[PDB]
mmCIF file of C-alpha atoms and ligand atoms in Angstrom:
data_model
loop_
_atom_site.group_PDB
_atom_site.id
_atom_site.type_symbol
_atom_site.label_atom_id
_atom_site.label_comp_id
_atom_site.label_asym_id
_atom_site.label_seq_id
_atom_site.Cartn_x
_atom_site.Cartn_y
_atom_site.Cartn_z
ATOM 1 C CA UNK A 417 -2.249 14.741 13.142
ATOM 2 C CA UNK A 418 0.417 11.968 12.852
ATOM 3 C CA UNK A 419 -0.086 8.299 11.843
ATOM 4 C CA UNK A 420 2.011 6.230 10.716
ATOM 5 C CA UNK A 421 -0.794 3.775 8.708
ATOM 6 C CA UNK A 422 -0.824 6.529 6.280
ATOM 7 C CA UNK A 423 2.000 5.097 4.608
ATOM 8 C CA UNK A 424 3.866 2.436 6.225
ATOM 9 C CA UNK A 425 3.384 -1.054 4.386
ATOM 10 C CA UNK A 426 6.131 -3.588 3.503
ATOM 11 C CA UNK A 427 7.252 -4.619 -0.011
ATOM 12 C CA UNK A 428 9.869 -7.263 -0.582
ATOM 13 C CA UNK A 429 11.602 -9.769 -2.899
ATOM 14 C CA UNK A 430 8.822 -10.908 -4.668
ATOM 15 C CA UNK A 431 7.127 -7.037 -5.206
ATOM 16 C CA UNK A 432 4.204 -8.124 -2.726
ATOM 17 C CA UNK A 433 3.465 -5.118 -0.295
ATOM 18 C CA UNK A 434 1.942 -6.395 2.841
ATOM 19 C CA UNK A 435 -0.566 -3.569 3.984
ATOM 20 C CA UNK A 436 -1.079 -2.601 7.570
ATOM 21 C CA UNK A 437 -4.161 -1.193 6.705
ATOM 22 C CA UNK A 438 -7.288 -3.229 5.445
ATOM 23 C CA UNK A 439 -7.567 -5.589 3.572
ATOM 24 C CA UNK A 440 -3.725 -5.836 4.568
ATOM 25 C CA UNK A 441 -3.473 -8.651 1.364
ATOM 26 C CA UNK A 442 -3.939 -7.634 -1.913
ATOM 27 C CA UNK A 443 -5.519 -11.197 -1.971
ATOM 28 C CA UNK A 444 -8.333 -10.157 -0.267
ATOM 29 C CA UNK A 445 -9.228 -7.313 -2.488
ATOM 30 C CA UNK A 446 -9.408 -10.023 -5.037
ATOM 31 C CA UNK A 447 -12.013 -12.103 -3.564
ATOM 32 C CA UNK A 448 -14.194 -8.909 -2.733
ATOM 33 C CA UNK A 449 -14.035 -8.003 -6.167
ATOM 34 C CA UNK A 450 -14.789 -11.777 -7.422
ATOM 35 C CA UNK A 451 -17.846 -11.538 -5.439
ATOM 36 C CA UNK A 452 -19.716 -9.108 -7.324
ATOM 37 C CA UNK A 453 -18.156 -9.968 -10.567
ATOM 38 C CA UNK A 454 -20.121 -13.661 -10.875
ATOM 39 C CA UNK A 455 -23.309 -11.971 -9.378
ATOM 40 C CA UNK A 456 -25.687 -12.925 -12.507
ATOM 41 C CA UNK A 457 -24.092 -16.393 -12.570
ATOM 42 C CA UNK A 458 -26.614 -17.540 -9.744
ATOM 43 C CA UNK A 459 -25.514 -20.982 -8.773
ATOM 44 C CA UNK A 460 -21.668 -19.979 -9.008
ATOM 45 C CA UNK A 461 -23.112 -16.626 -6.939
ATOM 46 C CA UNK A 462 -24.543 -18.556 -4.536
ATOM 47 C CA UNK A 463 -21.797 -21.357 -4.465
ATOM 48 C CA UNK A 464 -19.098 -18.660 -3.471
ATOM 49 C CA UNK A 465 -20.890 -16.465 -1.314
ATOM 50 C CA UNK A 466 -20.756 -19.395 0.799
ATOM 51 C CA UNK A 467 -17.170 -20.590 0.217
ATOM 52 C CA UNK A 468 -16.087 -16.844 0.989
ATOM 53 C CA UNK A 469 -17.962 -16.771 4.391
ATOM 54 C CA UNK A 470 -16.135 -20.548 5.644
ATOM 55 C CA UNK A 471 -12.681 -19.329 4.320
ATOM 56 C CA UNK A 472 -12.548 -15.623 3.616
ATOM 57 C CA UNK A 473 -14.143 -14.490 6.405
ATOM 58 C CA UNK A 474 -12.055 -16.506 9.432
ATOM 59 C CA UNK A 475 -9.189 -15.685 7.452
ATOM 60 C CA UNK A 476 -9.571 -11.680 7.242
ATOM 61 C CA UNK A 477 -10.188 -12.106 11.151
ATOM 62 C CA UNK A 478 -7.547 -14.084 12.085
ATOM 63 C CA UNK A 479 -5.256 -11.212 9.974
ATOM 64 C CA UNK A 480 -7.554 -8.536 11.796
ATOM 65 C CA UNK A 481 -6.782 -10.011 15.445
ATOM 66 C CA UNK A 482 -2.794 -10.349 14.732
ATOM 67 C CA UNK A 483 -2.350 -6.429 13.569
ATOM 68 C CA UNK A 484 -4.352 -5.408 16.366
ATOM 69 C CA UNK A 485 -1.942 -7.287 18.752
ATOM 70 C CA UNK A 486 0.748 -5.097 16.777
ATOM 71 C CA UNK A 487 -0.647 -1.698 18.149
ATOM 72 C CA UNK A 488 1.297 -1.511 21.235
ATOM 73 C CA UNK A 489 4.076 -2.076 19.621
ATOM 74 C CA UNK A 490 2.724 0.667 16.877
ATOM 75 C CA UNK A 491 2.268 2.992 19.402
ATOM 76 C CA UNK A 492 5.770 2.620 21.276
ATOM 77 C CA UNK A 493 7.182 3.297 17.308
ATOM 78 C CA UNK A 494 4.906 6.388 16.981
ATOM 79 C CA UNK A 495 6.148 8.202 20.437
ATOM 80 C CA UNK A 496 9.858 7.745 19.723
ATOM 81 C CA UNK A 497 9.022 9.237 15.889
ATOM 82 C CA UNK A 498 7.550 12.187 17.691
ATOM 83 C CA UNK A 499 10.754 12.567 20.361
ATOM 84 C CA UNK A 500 13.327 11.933 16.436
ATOM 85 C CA UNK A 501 10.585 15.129 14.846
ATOM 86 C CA UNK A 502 10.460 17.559 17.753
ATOM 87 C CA UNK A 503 13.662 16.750 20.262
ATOM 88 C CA UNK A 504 13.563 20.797 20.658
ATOM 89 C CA UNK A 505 10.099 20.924 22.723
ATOM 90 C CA UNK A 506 11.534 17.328 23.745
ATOM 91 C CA UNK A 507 15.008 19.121 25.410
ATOM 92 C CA UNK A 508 16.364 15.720 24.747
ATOM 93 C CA UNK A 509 19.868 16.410 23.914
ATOM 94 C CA UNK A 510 22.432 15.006 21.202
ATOM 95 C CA UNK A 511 23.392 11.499 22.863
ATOM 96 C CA UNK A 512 19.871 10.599 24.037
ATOM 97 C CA UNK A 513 18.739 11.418 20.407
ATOM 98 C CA UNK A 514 21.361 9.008 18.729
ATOM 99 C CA UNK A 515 20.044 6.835 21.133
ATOM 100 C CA UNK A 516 16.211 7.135 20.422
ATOM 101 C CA UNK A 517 17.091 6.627 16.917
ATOM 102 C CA UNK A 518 18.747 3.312 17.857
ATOM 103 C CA UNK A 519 16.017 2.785 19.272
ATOM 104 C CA UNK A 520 13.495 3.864 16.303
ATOM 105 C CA UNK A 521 15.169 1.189 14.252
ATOM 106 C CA UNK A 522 15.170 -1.739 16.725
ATOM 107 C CA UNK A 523 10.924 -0.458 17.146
ATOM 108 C CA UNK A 524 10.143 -0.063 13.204
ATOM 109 C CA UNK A 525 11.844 -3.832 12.946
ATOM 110 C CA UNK A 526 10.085 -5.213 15.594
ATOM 111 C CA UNK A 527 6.718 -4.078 14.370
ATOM 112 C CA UNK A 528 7.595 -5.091 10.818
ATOM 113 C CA UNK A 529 7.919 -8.645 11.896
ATOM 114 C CA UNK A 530 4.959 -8.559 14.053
ATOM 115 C CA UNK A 531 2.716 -7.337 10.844
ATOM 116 C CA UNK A 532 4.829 -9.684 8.365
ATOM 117 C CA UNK A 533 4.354 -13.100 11.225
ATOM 118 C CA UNK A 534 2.357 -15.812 9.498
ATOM 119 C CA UNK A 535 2.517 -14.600 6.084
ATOM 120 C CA UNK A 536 3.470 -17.249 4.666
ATOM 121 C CA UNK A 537 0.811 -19.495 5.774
ATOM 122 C CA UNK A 538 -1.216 -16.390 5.328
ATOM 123 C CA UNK A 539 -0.290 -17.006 1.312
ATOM 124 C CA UNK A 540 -1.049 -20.551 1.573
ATOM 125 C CA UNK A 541 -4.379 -20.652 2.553
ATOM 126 C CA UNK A 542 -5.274 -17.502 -0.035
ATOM 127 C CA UNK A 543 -3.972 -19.581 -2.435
ATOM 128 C CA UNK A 544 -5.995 -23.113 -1.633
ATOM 129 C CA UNK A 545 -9.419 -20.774 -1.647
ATOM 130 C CA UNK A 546 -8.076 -19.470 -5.183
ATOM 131 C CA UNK A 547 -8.232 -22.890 -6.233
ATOM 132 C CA UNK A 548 -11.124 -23.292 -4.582
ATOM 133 C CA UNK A 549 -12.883 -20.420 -6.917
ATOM 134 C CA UNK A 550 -11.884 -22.131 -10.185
ATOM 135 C CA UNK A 551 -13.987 -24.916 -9.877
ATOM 136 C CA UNK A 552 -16.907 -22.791 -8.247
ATOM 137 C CA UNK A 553 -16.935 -21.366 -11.315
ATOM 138 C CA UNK A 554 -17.797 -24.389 -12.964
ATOM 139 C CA UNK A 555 -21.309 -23.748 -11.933
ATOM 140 C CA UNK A 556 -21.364 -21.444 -14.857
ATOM 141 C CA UNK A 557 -24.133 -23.531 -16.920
ATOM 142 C CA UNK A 558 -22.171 -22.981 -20.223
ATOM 143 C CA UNK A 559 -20.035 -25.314 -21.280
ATOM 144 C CA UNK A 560 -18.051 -24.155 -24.141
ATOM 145 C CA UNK A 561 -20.685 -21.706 -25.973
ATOM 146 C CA UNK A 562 -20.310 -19.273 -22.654
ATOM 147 C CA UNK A 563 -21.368 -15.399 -23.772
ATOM 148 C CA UNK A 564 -18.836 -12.626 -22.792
ATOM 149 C CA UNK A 565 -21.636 -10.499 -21.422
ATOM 150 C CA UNK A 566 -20.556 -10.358 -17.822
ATOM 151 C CA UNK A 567 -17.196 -10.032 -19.180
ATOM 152 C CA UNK A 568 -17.588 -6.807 -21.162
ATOM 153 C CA UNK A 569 -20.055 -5.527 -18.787
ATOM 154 C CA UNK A 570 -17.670 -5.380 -15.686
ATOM 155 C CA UNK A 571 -14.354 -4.577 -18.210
ATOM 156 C CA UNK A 572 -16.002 -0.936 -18.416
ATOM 157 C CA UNK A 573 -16.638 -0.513 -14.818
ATOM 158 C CA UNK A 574 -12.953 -0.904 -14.211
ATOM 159 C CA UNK A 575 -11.766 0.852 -17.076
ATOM 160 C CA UNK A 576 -14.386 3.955 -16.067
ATOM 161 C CA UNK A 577 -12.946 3.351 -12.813
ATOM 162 C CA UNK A 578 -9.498 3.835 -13.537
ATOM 163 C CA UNK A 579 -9.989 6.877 -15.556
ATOM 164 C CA UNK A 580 -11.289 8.880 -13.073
ATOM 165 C CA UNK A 581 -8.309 9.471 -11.689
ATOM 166 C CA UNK A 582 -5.017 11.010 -12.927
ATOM 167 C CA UNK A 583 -1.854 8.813 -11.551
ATOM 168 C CA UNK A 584 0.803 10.866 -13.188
ATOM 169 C CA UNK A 585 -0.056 13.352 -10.706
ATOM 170 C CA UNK A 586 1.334 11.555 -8.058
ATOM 171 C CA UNK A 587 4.181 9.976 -9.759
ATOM 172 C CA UNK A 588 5.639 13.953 -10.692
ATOM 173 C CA UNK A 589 4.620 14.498 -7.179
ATOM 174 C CA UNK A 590 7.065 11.982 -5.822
ATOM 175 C CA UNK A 591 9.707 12.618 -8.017
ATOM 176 C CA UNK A 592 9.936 15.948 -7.726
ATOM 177 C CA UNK A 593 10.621 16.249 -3.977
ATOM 178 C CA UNK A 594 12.278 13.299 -4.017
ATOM 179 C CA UNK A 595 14.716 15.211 -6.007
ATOM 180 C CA UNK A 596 14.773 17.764 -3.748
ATOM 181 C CA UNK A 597 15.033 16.233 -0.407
ATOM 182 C CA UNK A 598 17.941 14.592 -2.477
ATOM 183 C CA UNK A 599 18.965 18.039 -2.634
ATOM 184 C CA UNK A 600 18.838 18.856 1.070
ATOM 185 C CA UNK A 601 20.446 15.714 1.930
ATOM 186 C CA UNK A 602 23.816 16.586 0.182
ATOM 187 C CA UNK A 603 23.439 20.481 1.610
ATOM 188 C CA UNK A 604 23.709 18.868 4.983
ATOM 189 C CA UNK A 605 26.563 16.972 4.267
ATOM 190 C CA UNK A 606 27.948 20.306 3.733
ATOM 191 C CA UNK A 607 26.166 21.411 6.729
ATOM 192 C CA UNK A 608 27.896 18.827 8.814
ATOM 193 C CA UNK A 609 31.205 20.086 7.694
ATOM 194 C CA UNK A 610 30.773 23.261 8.937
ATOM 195 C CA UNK A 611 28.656 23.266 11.970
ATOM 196 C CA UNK A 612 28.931 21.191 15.289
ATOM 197 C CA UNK A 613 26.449 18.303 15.197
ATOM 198 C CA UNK A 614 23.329 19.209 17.298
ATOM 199 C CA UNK A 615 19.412 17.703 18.116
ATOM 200 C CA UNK A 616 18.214 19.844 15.106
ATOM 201 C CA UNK A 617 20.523 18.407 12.568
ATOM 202 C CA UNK A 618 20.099 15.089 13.908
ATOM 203 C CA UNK A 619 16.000 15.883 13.249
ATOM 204 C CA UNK A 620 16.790 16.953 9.396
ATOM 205 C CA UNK A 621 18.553 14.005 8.654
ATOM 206 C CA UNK A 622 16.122 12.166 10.034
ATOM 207 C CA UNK A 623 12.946 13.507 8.618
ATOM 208 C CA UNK A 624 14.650 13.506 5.460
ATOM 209 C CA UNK A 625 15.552 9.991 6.011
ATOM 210 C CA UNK A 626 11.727 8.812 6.469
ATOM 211 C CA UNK A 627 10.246 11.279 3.838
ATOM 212 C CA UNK A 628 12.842 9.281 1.064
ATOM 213 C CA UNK A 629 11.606 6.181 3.190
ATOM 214 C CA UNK A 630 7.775 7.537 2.413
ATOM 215 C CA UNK A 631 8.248 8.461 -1.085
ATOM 216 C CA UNK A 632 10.060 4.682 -1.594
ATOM 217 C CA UNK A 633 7.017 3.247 -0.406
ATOM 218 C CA UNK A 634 4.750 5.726 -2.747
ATOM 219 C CA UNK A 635 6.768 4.703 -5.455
ATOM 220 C CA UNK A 636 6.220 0.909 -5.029
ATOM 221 C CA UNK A 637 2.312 1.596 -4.781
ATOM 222 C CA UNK A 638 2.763 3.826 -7.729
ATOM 223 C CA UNK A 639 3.873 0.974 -9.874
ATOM 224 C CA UNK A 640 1.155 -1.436 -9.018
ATOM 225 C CA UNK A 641 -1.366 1.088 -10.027
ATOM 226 C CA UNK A 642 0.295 1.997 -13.324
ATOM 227 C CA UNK A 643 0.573 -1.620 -13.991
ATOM 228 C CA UNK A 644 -3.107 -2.686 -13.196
ATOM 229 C CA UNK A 645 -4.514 0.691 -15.001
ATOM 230 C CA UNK A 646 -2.904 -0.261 -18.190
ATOM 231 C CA UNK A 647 -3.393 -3.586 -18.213
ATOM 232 C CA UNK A 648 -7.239 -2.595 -17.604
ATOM 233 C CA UNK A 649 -6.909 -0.349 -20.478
ATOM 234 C CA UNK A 650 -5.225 -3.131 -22.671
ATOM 235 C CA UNK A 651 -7.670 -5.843 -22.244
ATOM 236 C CA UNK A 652 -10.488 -2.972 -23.575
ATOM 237 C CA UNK A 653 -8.036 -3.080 -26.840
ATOM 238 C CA UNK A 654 -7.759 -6.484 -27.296
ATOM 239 C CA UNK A 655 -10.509 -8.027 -28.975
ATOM 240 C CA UNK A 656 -12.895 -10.636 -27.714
ATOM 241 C CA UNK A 657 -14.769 -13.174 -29.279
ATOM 242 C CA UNK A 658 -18.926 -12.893 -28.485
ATOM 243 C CA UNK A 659 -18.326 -16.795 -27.542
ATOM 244 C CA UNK A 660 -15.688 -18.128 -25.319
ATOM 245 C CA UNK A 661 -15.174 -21.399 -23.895
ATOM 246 C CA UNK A 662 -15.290 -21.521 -19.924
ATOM 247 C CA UNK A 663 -12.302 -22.219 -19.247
ATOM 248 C CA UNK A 664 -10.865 -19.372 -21.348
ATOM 249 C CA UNK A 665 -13.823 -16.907 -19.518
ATOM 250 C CA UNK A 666 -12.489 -17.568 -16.070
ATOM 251 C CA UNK A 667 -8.914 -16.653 -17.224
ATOM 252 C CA UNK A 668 -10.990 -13.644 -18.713
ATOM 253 C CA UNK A 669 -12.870 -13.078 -15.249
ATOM 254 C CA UNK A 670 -9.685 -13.718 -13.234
ATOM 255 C CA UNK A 671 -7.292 -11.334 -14.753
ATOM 256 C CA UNK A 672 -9.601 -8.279 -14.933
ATOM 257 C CA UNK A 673 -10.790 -8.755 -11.508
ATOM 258 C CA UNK A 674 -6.676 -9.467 -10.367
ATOM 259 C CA UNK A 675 -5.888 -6.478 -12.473
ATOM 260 C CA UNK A 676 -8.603 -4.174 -10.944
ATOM 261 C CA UNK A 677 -7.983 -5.331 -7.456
ATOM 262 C CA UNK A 678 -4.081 -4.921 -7.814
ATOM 263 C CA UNK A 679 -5.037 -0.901 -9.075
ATOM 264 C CA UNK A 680 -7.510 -0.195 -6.134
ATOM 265 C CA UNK A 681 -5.324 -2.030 -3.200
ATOM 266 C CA UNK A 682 -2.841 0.196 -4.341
ATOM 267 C CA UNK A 683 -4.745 3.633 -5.412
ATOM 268 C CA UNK A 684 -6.187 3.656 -1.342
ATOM 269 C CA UNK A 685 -2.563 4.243 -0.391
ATOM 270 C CA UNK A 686 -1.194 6.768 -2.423
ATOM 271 C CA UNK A 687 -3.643 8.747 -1.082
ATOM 272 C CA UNK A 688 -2.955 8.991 2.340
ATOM 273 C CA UNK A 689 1.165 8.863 1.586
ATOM 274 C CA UNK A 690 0.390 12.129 0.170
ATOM 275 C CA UNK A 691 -0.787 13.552 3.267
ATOM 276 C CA UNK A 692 1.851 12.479 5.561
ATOM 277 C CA UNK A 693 4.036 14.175 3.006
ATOM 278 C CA UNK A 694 2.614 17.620 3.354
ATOM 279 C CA UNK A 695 2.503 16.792 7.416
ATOM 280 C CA UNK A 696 6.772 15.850 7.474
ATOM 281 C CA UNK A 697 7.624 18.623 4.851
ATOM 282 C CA UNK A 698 5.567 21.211 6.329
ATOM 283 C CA UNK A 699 7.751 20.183 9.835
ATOM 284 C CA UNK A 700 10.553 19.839 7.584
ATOM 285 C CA UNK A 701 11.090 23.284 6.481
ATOM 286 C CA UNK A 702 10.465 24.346 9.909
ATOM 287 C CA UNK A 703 13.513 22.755 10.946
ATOM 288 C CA UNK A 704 15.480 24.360 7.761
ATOM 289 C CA UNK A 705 14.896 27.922 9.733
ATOM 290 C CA UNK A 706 15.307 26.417 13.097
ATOM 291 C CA UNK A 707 19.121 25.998 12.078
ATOM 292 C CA UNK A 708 19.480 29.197 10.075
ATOM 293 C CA UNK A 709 19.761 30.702 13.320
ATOM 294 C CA UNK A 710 22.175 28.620 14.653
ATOM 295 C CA UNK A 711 24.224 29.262 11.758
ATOM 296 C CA UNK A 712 23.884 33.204 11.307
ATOM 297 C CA UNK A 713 25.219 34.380 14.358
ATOM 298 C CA UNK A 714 27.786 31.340 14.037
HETATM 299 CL CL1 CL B 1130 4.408 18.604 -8.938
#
């Protein structure tokens, strides 16, 4: 049952994770959530449903069309990840291994850079239809006596929203056999020491390797989720005149929907990282007896 999409995005310098799973942007999110948000405002509705079919749309397939141009490559990644995990039933031997895993590297680059091409001007043009929704919004009939109705109404759909689910669940989850595959990697260290290097040792180290890898990832989706649940939770605190100007209610509108969106883009793949978990420890600990029979009679 392996797949890589379970888990493998790409975070960077700036803390963006670029998602090779729809919506792939946490951009995107934002606009879908936008959508619904101004949905009793009926001329901005109406306004932005049709600015979100001439940008959004062509955008999302333009993203859609490049990562499926990636799958090849994907799949040439996936097959040398299931030679790394099982070189036994493989009866590939040391030096082809070290040489699969050479190649692993080169594969997991290559399709890195095919997912990350264009993302800058990706950015850019998610950033001119953000403008673009500020002064949509100005079709909000109010001028500067604007009610926080819509406001309120939508802040306790997200904050029911992100109650529902328990994230320090996942965060002891992570940290916990993080620590212990921690563990395991300074055992074979010792392991190394004693026992001549071999295709099952190789296969430790390197599902022990991508698991850390895995749980690095989790951890980065961890902390946007944390951070747009509290913030959520914070703006139900912080209290809110029953008038607003506009321009201070599509600050209002912006940051709970940016907030939400960040939580949800985020929530979809700590899921799934989960799973492949269970899937590489459960092969994992496999391994672990594979070589306690090497060693015994050793
Ligand atoms: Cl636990």
């Amino acid at each position: 049952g392996s797949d890589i999409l379970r888990y493998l995005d790409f975070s960077n310098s700036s803390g963006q994770i670029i998602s090779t799973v729809y919506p792939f942007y946490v951009q995107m999110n934002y606009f879908a959530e936008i959508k619904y948000y101004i949905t009793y405002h009926y001329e901005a509705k109406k306004n932005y449903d049709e600015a979100y079919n001439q940008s959004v749309n062509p955008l999302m397939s333009s993203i859609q069309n490049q990562i499926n141009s990636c799958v090849p490559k994907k799949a040439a990644l996936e097959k040398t990840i299931f030679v790394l995990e099982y070189p036994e039933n493989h009866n590939i031997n040391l030096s082809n291994y070290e040489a699969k895993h050479n190649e692993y590297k080169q594969q997991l680059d290559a399709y890195k850079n095919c997912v990350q091409a264009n993302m800058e001007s990706y950015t850019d043009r998610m950033s001119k239809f953000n403008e673009k929704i500020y002064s949509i919004l100005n079709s909000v009939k109010c001028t500067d006596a604007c009610e926080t109705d819509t406001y309120e109404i939508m802040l306790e759909i997200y904050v029911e929203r992100v109650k529902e689910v328990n994230h320090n669940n996942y965060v002891n989850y992570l940290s916990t056999l993080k620590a212990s595959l921690q563990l395991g990697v300074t055992l074979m260290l010792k392991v190394k020491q004693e026992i001549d290097n071999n295709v099952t040792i190789s296969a430790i180290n390197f599902l022990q390797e991508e698991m850390l890898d895995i749980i690095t990832i989790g951890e980065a989706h961890t902390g946007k989720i944390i951070h747009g649940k509290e913030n959520v939770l914070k703006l139900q605190n912080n209290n809110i005149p029953p008038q607003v100007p506009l321009s201070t209610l599509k600050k209002l509108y912006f940051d709970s929907a940016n907030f939400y969106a960040t939580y949800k883009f985020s929530l979809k793949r700590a899921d799934t990282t989960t799973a492949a978990l269970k899937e590489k420890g459960k092969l994992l600990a496999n391994l672990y007896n594979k070589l306690i029979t090497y060693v015994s009679e050793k």
